[PDB]
Amino acid sequence: KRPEGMHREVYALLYSDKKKVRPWKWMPFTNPARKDGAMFFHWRRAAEEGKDYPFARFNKTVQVPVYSEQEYQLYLHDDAWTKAETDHLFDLSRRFDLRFVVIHDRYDHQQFKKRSVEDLKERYYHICAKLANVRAVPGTDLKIPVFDAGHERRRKEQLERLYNRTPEQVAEEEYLLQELRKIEARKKEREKRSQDLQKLITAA
Amino acid sequence: KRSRKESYSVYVYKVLKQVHPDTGISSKAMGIMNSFVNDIFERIAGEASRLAHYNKRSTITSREIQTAVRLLLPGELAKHAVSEGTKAVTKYTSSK
Amino acid sequence: MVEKKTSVRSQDPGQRRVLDRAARQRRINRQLEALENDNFQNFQALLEEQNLSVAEGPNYLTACAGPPSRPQRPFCAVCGFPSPYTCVSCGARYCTVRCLGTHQETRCLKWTV
Amino acid sequence: DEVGALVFDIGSYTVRAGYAGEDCPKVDFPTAIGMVVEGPTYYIDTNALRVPRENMEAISPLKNGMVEDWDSFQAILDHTYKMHVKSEASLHPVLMSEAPWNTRAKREKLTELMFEHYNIPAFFLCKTAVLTAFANGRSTGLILDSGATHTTAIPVHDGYVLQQGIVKSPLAGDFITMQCRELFQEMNIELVPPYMIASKEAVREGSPANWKRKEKLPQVTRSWHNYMCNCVIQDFQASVLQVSDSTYDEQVAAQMPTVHYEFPNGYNCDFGAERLKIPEGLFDPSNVKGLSGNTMLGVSHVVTTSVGMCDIDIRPGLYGSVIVAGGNTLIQSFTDRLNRELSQKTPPSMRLKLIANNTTVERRFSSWIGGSILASLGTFQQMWISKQEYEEGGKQCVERKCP
Amino acid sequence: KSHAEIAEQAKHEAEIETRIAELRKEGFWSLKRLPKVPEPPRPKGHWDYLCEEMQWLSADFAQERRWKRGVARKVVRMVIRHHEEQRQKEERARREEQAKLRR
Amino acid sequence: RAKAKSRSSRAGLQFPVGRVHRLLRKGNYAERVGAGAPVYLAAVLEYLTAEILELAGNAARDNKKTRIIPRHLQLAIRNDEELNKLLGRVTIAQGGVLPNIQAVLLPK
Numbered sequence A: 001k002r003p004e005g006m007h008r009e010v011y012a013l014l015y016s017d018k019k020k021v022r023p024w025k026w027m028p029f030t031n032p033a034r035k036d037g038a039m040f041f042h043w044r045r046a047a048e049e050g051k052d053y054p055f056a057r058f059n060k061t062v063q064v065p066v067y068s069e070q071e072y073q074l075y076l077h078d079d080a081w082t083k084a085e086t087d088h089l090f091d092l093s094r095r096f097d098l099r100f101v102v103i104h105d106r107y108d109h110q111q112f113k114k115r116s117v118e119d120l121k122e123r124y125y126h127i128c129a130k131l132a133n134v135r136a137v138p139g140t141d142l143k144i145p146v147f148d149a150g151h152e153r154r155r156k157e158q159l160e161r162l163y164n165r166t167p168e169q170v171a172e173e174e175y176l177l178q179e180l181r182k183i184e185a186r187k188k189e190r191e192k193r194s195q196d197l198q199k200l201i202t203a204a
Numbered sequence B: 001k002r003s004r005k006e007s008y009s010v011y012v013y014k015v016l017k018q019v020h021p022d023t024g025i026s027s028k029a030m031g032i033m034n035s036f037v038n039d040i041f042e043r044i045a046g047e048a049s050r051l052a053h054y055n056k057r058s059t060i061t062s063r064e065i066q067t068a069v070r071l072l073l074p075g076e077l078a079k080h081a082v083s084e085g086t087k088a089v090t091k092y093t094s095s096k
Numbered sequence C: 001m002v003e004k005k006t007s008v009r010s011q012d013p014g015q016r017r018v019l020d021r022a023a024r025q026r027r028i029n030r031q032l033e034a035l036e037n038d039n040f041q042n043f044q045a046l047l048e049e050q051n052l053s054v055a056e057g058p059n060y061l062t063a064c065a066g067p068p069s070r071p072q073r074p075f076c077a078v079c080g081f082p083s084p085y086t087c088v089s090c091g092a093r094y095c096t097v098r099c100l101g102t103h104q105e106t107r108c109l110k111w112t113v
Numbered sequence D: 001d002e003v004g005a006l007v008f009d010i011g012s013y014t015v016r017a018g019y020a021g022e023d024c025p026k027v028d029f030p031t032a033i034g035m036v037v038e039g040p041t042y043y044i045d046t047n048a049l050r051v052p053r054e055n056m057e058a059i060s061p062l063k064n065g066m067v068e069d070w071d072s073f074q075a076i077l078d079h080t081y082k083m084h085v086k087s088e089a090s091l092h093p094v095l096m097s098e099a100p101w102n103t104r105a106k107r108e109k110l111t112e113l114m115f116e117h118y119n120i121p122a123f124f125l126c127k128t129a130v131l132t133a134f135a136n137g138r139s140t141g142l143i144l145d146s147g148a149t150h151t152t153a154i155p156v157h158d159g160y161v162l163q164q165g166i167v168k169s170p171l172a173g174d175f176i177t178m179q180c181r182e183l184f185q186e187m188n189i190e191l192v193p194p195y196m197i198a199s200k201e202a203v204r205e206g207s208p209a210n211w212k213r214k215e216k217l218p219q220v221t222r223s224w225h226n227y228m229c230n231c232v233i234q235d236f237q238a239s240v241l242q243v244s245d246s247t248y249d250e251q252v253a254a255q256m257p258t259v260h261y262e263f264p265n266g267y268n269c270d271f272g273a274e275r276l277k278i279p280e281g282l283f284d285p286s287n288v289k290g291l292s293g294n295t296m297l298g299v300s301h302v303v304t305t306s307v308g309m310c311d312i313d314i315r316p317g318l319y320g321s322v323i324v325a326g327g328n329t330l331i332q333s334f335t336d337r338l339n340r341e342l343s344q345k346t347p348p349s350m351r352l353k354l355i356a357n358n359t360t361v362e363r364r365f366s367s368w369i370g371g372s373i374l375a376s377l378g379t380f381q382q383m384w385i386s387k388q389e390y391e392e393g394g395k396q397c398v399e400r401k402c403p
Numbered sequence E: 001k002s003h004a005e006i007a008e009q010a011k012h013e014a015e016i017e018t019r020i021a022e023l024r025k026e027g028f029w030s031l032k033r034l035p036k037v038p039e040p041p042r043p044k045g046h047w048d049y050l051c052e053e054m055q056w057l058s059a060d061f062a063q064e065r066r067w068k069r070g071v072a073r074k075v076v077r078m079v080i081r082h083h084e085e086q087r088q089k090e091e092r093a094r095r096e097e098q099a100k101l102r103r
Numbered sequence F: 001r002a003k004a005k006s007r008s009s010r011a012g013l014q015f016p017v018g019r020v021h022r023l024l025r026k027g028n029y030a031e032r033v034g035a036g037a038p039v040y041l042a043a044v045l046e047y048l049t050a051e052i053l054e055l056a057g058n059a060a061r062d063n064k065k066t067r068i069i070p071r072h073l074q075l076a077i078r079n080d081e082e083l084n085k086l087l088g089r090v091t092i093a094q095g096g097v098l099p100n101i102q103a104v105l106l107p108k
């Protein structure tokens, strides 16, 4: 008699063609990446209670040079910037990881004169350059192409005219756009075609 | 207004990338890889079709599919194909 | 949930087609040169100036000792201990069932291309 | 990463509270809580708050999204701690939302109040825009929030708010509430809040209600009565209002379908074009009788102004990541109309994209959800203002730590 | 061609004029994009790790919410099926009685 | 409802069971397809695809090429004893042939 006893399809295919004792625990842990010794609490197994935190490696502080008072006074001095005016920039640099689209917005415009993004960037960069220059001799790569502010002030600007163009220059420009082809076709398809026809009729 | 045409390229690269992690496959070679799949699909389905019709049956089944794979693929080719499919049907009806 | 490897089904050895004889030699040779290889895990210049140095007189090429009188000893290659066994396919040696398992899973047939 | 910690989102209209890592807040309750100067006694759960009471204040502690009544704010947090969370504050770190325009004095006062009154182990004060960005899975984007009190566009770039890019407008849920008041008055509707009705009978469309008033009602004060009526009005806003898919057209709005509605006393009627005219004031305030003036910016214009005040280099990101929040954004066709007008007025040089969240919890409580996700990361467990930061640096630590 | 093309081409010459005018007015294109960017990027950075990890965890949160809503809905559907089976129970008893009549 | 699981996944295949069964449902290959036919057919289809992709890639490596060309297919399907049989009456475009030079046509 047919043994079967299993699933119909599988059966036909086969025959027709013959204690955990690992207690988790609510646990205190200190993050070695912190300097304040703050104790937090965590949901860890029993077998790892006491190991160091695995998220302290995700702490790569952005590097920013730290000029000293003497050093600043000698070389970083700038007639248009005061020390109170310059230390603030680097503090914002560090607290915002050396990003200058968010350093600007939080600039202290009450004690401080209004600066664009480009001037702040150039200022911090000349400061970094001269900080490394105090070293210089210790192979301090005096080849730094510090951010161009002039060309770049422009380059910011000559995007802005093209940013807010309600029609014409956004719309009507299509015309001139097509003209780029026409101006690049019909002139040579004109003066050159004429000269070729003059030679062709000269030989003719 | 699109005219999209289907092909097997997405699953022949899953299987190839898995059975040759470092080896790629050219577009022209994937065309052959697609035509091969469609050809064998046609062959096995046609033989299962005939199998069902010979026994006066209106339905092509996986049992007929296995017998068509026994008829189509040569000895080893068959054995491996039959084993692979047979084990894929018991991994599917066990609700995994 | 599922056994979660039938999707990749890497080896599926119904068509295994063992690698043998000269292929073993290739592997042996490869391993030798790898043990002779360098930092990356000029050699062409070395081979070139060595092929300039070919001659029958006493020189680099003719300074090779040769085969040893004391016969080759077996070692396991997974843990390096003396090995009573040989792998039937590739000929590499091992000393336990466990070691054969690891070898079959990582070094048998997989690095012969 | 995820520790027993409390997430608070204190909106102008409702407060949300819960634990880290939940999909939704543990509790949500009205911010405009009830009070009687008995010290004073407070009511927050809607069951005690909707009782017609021998005396009433309906105090509403926040002004323009910022704390002004610290006593009622403290009472709210006390009641939240021991009515819904029911846990000792000294055990759980606290992550709390704030308006992007909140002043430093408020931040410091909240810090010292949290550490002295609630003895908490750690603190983190974060702005609604950044929380909403985290909730929507982006580090950069324009956060538009159309809340009860004001509609605000706040650019977040690389996780930080751009103060120079903040744009705010009073066109908001309270303005819609005022418009509903005016429309009901012009329709001569007998708006009756739910607490007053003992029983009622059915009446025909447009006919006055047939109802009995409760006999035990005390002499309630004007503020609480206004609050209750405004609750009915905001239910009407959910029930009836709909933004015109395009610029309001009286002819089209006359062709649009009606929506039937009933007020608590039983008065019931169909609403037509008017239910589309009210929300139009959010998008073009020029045609808003009684609120004439070109200084007002509508939702779409709030957005475009906010992005336009930023650097042109980050405008592509902001327009490509418009994240829309706030309860008013739940109005039918609100997001479609916003997308249409922004597609018309965004410069062709840049992609426009609105993030596609639609659920009530999403649209409103994005800030709380942002707290929930943010409090659940290892990289965030080093950003806390600990009790030691406060004991050493004092109340000012919140200025030196997270923006 | 035709000598009449003098007019057409003259119109094209006017197109050049407007071109020139517009090029004096504002220009056709935002030429010379980012010629000079000396700022070196960070190694990877703490804030970027936070952004990356929240990129992952937001998708995880969305998947979990979607999954649990679907799970709840299919538990509702499964219990609906169980209840209508707890009425097919009565039907099965009635059908067994009819089978008893037939027996 | 429940998170939808596909049919290639439950079985554990790469080739589309949905698409395979689909060509079958509206392919008139039969009249009422069951619930195992597409699974078996796709499994074996993709098995042969793997079987060949193997030999093709191996010959490719023999040629010191990382991309399988149709040559890596002619050479393979003619190099394997049973693939050649299965694909005996099949020409592979741009594959070539194998350098089988008759012994009697050689230098003597």
Ligand SMILES: Nc1ncnc2c1ncn2[C@@H]1O[C@H](COP(=O)(O)OP(=O)(O)OP(=O)(O)O)[C@@H](O)[C@H]1O
Pocket (backbone or CB within 6 Å): D010, D011, D012, D013, D014, D065, D128, D145, D146, D147, D148, D149, D150, D172, D173, D174, D176, D177, D234, D237, D238, D239, D325, D326, D327, D328, D329, D330, D331, D363, D364, D365
């Ligand atoms: N379902 C709904 N449909 C339409 N509008 C609604 C709906 N629910 C609430 N609103 C409107 O949203 C307003 C409340 O919005 P919301 O709850 O987002 O504000 P909030 O969180 O207190 O704001 P903020 O954080 O800006 O202070 C209510 O006044 C009402 O006008």
